[PDB]
Swiss-Prot record:
Domain comment quoted from the record: The N-terminal domain is essential for RNAP assembly and basal transcription, whereas the C-terminal domain is involved in interaction with transcriptional regulators and with upstream promoter elements.
Listed name of the protein: DNA-directed RNA polymerase subunit alpha
Function: DNA-dependent RNA polymerase catalyzes the transcription of DNA into RNA using the four ribonucleoside triphosphates as substrates.
SUBUNIT field: Homodimer. The RNAP catalytic core consists of 2 alpha, 1 beta, 1 beta' and 1 omega subunit. When a sigma factor is associated with the core the holoenzyme is formed, which can initiate transcription.
Record region (Alpha C-terminal domain (alpha-CTD)): 1-70
Organism: Vibrio cholerae serotype O1 (strain ATCC 39541 / Classical Ogawa 395 / O395)
Family designation: Belongs to the RNA polymerase alpha chain family.
Amino acid sequence: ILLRPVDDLELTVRSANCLKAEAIHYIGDLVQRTEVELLKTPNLGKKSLTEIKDVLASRGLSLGMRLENW
DNA sequence: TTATGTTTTTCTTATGTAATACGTCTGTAACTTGTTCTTATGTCTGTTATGTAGTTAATATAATTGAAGGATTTTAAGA
DNA sequence: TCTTAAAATCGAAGTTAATATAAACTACATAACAGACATAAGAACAAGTTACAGACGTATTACATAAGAAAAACATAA
């Protein structure tokens, strides 16, 4: 699922309002958005990164995706 | 030959130095809760349309409506 | 027992889409329409509370290194 807006991720209000500021609107950014850079962002800890990765894993996706052109 | 002052060395402690681990403060969010303004609606009331009941005094005094090349068979009523 | 009147029936589908003449007035009660008001339902704004997350700040732990103190050895004088 690389064709959905991030708001369709069923993300909680905290994660949605955080990731909205980083101009991250499609999963294609997030699948290669590195774990470290995701952790550096304001208001995003390990226990929320866990749920982000869990929602990704439910729909096949995950972080750490070497990828292709746009 | 031996006692003693000295100097260097090693052990001991002290301030800093850092690493990882874990608690506090604070910033956002879920959950309610009170207050005020707005709105659709149910209900009351006045006015007009309408639907019903009644009355009318030359005299007048036993329908109508078609219906029209039907044959064949069965079964009740008359005699 | 013989006429004689009634009674009943007469293939399927398919199609096959209206007619169409002919008293007045008055009084009264009832239903319907329109306007306005109050009520129940609804929406928006702000506030309290209860908790969890996030990254910072505290305490536990293991030390590096340099200053200070004790001691052993050495050289010297009586």
